[PDB]
Symmetry: C2
Subunit: 263 residues, 2 copies
């Protein structure tokens, strides 16, 4: 009985609408500075040619072409290739380093298809464990005072969760990495959400520390990822609630509009 109707259609449109709203807000937020920068870089070239007429346009385009090539590629060392494998199985894939060989690519393909499932188990376990650790913290002392206390518990969850997994590591990145108060939190979310643009990596900037920072960051990821995995899932539940509430509020409006128009 094919009553199994396509509910996806509604969601699809909401997503399409969500992208349109996004695209516009990003255009309005980034296209301005793109222009200012697009002009300041033109002012920098002309400054270069004149301040150093010793290099001509024809010798400048060669320079700029060779550096875009050098762009294509200290790396792949003892530990760099180790984090590369980290961004593969985690799917964060910052991309600051990526294979350039046909073999590295193929191996990355296989290394990922087998790596991501495996890491999922680890992350799954780490989650359940961290989910029980809070199972030793939340319900026990939160019962000191049906769905009314649940809201304080969840607030306690996200609040500390942001402190341990977002606040503190952001503060540490701010000092150690030399990032903005915002840039740090930006990195945390872009990373722990697995987005991983790669615009900010917690290990670029050739080298400053040793032996007490990258291990913490790594295990930060191992646990932070599990934390957002839970967080994102709640936001998914929240949205599911809001959807049905808005579904019933719509039938609410219609009932009155109809019950009114009948007059």
């Amino acid at each position: 009985n094919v009553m199994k109707w396509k509910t996806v259609s509604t969601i699809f449109l909401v997503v399409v609408l969500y992208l349109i709203i996004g695209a516009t807000v990003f255009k309005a937020l980034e296209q301005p500075q793109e222009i200012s920068q697009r002009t300041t870089i033109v002012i920098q070239r002309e400054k270069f040619l004149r301040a150093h007429p010793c290099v001509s346009d024809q010798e400048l385009d060669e320079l700029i072409q060779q550096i875009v090539a050098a762009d294509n590629a200290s790396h792949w060392d003892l530990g760099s290739s180790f984090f590369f494998a980290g961004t593969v199985i985690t799917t964060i894939g910052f991309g600051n380093i990526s294979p350039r060989t046909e073999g590295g690519k193929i191996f990355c393909i296989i290394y990922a298809l087998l790596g991501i499932p495996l890491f999922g188990f680890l992350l799954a376990g780490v989650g359940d464990q961290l989910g029980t650790i809070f199972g030793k913290g939340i319900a026990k002392v939160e019962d000191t005072f049906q769905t009314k206390i649940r809201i304080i518990s969840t607030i306690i969850f996200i609040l500390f969760g942001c402190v341990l997994f977002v606040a503190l590591p952001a503060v540490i990145f701010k000092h150690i990495e030399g990032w903005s108060a915002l840039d740090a939190i930006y990195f945390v979310v872009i990373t722990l959400t697995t987005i991983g643009f790669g615009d900010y990596v917690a290990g670029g900037s050739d080298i400053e520390y040793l032996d007490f920072y990258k291990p913490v960051v790594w295990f930060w990821i191992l646990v932070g990822l599990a934390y957002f995995a839970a967080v994102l899932s709640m936001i998914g539940d929240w949205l599911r609630v809001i959807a049905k509430k808005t579904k019933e509020a719509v039938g609410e409006f219609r009932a009155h509009a109809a019950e009114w128009t009948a007059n």
Copy 2:
């Protein structure tokens, strides 16, 4: 709590397995990428010397000054067309909510960054429902098709399940990897390997960004990008399943080899 010990024992064992898996991976990439790295790290210095010595003009020490300005301008990919125009920003939000995050173009304003955080915090869960719905919808289209082809093989229960999964992977690779990779090769002027490498890096949601179905503004036929969206939307759902299956196989191989080691340890070849 009697189970809390055993679950912790499995997590710890899996973590250690993960550590070893990273170690074997890093070693294989290092051994296969660092050579070309050093080959290029020396030829780029050869070019600098050819540049510095041919005209070590007063700015010879101010050279790295320039290279810092263009590398910084590189992150914005300056062309010494807008990358935040109507459509490009639309593709950006797509790279955000799908967590592909190619990163080639990312926000630079505090406002852009703060909205991007909120946008992902809300967008990721949202897109998850769509991808689920797409998964289910595509799953029932294979259920309608798997019934026709499993009854032609029922001419003669626990063994036909393998024939079904094979045809899945087969049509899966065909529609979602083979065809699109081909189109990427022709249009994007990519190699046979780069296209598949792209498809895998993209649909596994890793998204290095070294390759992008529109990263270059080349000429882009008027329906190219829409078709690619649909590819992404159904390609991601496909790999979600394939990845989910590979996990099962791992767990099968995992717990089957676990007993094989106890098997081994017990006998030890009669000793």
